Structure formats: structure tokens, C-alpha cells
mmCIF file of C-alpha atoms in Angstrom:
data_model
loop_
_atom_site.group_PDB
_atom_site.id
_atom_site.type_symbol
_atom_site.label_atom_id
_atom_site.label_comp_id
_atom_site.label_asym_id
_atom_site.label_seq_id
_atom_site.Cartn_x
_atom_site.Cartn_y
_atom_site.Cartn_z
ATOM 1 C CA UNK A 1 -56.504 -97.739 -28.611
ATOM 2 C CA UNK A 2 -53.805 -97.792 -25.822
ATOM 3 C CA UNK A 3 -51.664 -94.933 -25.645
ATOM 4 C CA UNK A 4 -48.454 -95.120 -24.040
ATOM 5 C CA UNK A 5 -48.629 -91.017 -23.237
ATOM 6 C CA UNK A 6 -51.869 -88.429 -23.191
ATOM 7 C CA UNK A 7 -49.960 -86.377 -25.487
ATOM 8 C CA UNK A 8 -52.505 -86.768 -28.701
ATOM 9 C CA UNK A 9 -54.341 -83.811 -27.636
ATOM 10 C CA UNK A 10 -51.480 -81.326 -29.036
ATOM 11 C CA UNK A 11 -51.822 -82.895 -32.100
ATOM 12 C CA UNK A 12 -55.143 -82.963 -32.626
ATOM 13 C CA UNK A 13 -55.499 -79.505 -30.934
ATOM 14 C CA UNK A 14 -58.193 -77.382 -32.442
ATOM 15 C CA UNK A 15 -60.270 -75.212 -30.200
ATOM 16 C CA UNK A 16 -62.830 -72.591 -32.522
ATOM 17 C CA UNK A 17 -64.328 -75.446 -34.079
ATOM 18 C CA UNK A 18 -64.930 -77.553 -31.362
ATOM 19 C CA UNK A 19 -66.231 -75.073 -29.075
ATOM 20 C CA UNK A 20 -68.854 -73.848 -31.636
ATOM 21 C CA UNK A 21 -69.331 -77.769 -32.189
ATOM 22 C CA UNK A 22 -69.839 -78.469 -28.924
ATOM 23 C CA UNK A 23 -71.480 -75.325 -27.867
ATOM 24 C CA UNK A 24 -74.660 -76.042 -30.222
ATOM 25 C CA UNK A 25 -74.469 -79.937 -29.447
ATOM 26 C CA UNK A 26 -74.512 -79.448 -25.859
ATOM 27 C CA UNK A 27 -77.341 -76.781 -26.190
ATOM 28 C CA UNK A 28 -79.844 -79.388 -27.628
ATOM 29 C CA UNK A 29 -78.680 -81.435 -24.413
ATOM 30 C CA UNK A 30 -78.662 -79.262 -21.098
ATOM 31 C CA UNK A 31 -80.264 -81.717 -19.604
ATOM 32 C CA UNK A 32 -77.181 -84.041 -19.795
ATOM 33 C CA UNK A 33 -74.926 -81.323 -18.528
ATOM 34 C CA UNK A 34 -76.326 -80.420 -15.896
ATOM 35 C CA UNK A 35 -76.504 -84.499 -14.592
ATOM 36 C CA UNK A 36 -73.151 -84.696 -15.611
ATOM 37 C CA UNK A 37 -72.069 -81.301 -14.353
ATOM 38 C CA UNK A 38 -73.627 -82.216 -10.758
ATOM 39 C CA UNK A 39 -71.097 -85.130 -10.646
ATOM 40 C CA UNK A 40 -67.845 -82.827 -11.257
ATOM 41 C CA UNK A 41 -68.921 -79.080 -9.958
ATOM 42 C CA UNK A 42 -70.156 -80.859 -6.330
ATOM 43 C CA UNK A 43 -71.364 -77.089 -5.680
ATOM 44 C CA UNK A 44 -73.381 -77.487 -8.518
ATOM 45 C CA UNK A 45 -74.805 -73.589 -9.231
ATOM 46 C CA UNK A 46 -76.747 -74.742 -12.362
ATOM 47 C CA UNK A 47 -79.760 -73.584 -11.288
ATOM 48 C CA UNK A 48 -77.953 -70.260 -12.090
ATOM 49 C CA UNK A 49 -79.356 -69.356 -15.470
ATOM 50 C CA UNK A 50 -79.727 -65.925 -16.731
ATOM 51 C CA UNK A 51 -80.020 -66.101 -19.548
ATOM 52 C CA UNK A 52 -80.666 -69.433 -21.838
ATOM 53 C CA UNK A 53 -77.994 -72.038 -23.333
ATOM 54 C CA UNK A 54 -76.389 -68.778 -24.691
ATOM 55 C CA UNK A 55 -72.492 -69.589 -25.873
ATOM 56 C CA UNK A 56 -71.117 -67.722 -22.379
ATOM 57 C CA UNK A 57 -73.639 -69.345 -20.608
ATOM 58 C CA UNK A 58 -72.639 -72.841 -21.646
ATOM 59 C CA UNK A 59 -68.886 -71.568 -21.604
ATOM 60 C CA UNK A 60 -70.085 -70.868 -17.130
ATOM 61 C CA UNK A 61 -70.896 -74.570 -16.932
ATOM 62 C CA UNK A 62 -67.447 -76.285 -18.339
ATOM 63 C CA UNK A 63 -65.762 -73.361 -16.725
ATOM 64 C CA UNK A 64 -66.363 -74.812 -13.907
ATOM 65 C CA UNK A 65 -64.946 -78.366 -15.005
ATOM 66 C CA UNK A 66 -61.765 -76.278 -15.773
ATOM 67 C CA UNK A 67 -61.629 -75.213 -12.530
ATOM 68 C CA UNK A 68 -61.793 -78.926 -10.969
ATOM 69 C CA UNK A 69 -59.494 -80.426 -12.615
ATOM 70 C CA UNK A 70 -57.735 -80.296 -16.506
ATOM 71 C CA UNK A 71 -57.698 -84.213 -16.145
ATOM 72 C CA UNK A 72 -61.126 -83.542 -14.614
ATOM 73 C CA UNK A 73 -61.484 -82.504 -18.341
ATOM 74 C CA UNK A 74 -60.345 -85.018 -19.984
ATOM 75 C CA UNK A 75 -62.230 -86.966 -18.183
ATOM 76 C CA UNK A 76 -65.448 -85.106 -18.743
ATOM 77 C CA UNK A 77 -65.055 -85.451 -22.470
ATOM 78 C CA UNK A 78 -64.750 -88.847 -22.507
ATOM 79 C CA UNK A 79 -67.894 -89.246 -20.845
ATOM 80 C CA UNK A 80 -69.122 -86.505 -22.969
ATOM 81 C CA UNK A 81 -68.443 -88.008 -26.268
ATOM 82 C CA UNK A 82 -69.528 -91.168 -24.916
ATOM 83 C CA UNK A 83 -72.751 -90.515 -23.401
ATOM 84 C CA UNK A 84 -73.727 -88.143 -26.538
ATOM 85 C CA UNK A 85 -73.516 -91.193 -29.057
ATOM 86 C CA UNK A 86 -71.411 -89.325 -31.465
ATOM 87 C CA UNK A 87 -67.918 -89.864 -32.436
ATOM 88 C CA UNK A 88 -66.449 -86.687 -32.813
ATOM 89 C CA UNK A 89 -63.147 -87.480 -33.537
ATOM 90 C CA UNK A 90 -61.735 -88.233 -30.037
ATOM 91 C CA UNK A 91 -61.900 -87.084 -26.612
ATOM 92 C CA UNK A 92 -58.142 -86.061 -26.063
ATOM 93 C CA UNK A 93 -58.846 -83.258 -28.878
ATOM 94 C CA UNK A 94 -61.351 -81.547 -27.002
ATOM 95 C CA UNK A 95 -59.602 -81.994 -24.049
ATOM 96 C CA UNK A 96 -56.970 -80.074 -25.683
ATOM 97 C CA UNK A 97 -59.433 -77.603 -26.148
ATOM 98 C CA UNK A 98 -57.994 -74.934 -23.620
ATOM 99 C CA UNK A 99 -54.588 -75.362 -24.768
ATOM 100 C CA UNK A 100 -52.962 -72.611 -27.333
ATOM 101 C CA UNK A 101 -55.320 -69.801 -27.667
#
């Protein structure tokens, strides 16, 4: 819907839950990360990969997001929840995400 201000992100903040949500979804896509990472991260280190789509390791790749831009986050989710089919809830929540602990 239109929103006057961005603000519905500390309301719907949550942050353990969505990270373990979006950890395991995100796993069984790192194919679509990666594509969408290359767009954001324009130094795109994927190919660094230690170990697997381990928690830390998927925490490295939207890291990076945080890095280009918090509205570069917001804007990745959107994308995110879009291109993934599934309605989580929002975007603006998860964008939230690495607000208050």
C-alpha cells in the first residue's frame, strides 16, 4: 500500500526469526543470491565459499548488502520477497532486520 514514511519496519521489527527464516529459505536458493548479489556487491567475491550455505556463510553474502547500502537493503528484500514467490509478511520487516539487537 502507499506509505507516507518507511517507518513500518520498527514495528514489525523481529530479527531471530527471520534470519533463521531466511537463512534456510535462501539456502535452498543460492543460486538466486548469488544473481542477485552480483547486482548489489559489484565486487562480487561469491565464488568465495568455504564452506557450504552454512548460517555465517550466508550471513558473508548479505553482509555485504549491509555494507552497500541499508536502503540498499531494503531494497534487496523487496526484490527478495518478490523474486522468491512467498509472502513473508513484508519487506520493510526484514529490512528492519539489523535494527535492535
Amino acid at each position: 500500500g502507499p506509505l507516507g514514511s518507511m517507518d513500518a519496519e520498527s514495528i514489525r521489527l523481529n530479527n531471530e526469526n527471520l534470519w533463521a527464516w531466511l537463512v534456510r529459505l535462501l539456502s535452498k536458493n543460492p543460486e538466486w543470491l548469488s544473481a542477485k548479489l552480483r547486482s548489489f556487491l559489484p565486487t562480487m567475491d561469491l565464488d568465495c565459499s568455504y564452506e557450504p550455505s552454512n548460517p555465517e556463510v550466508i550471513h558473508r553474502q548479505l553482509n555485504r548488502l549491509f555494507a552497500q547500502g541499508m536502503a540498499t537493503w531494503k531494497s534487496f528484500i523487496n526484490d527478495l520477497c518478490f523474486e522468491l514467490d512467498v509472502p513473508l509478511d513484508m519487506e520493510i520487516p526484514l529490512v528492519s532486520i539489523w535494527g535492535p539487537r
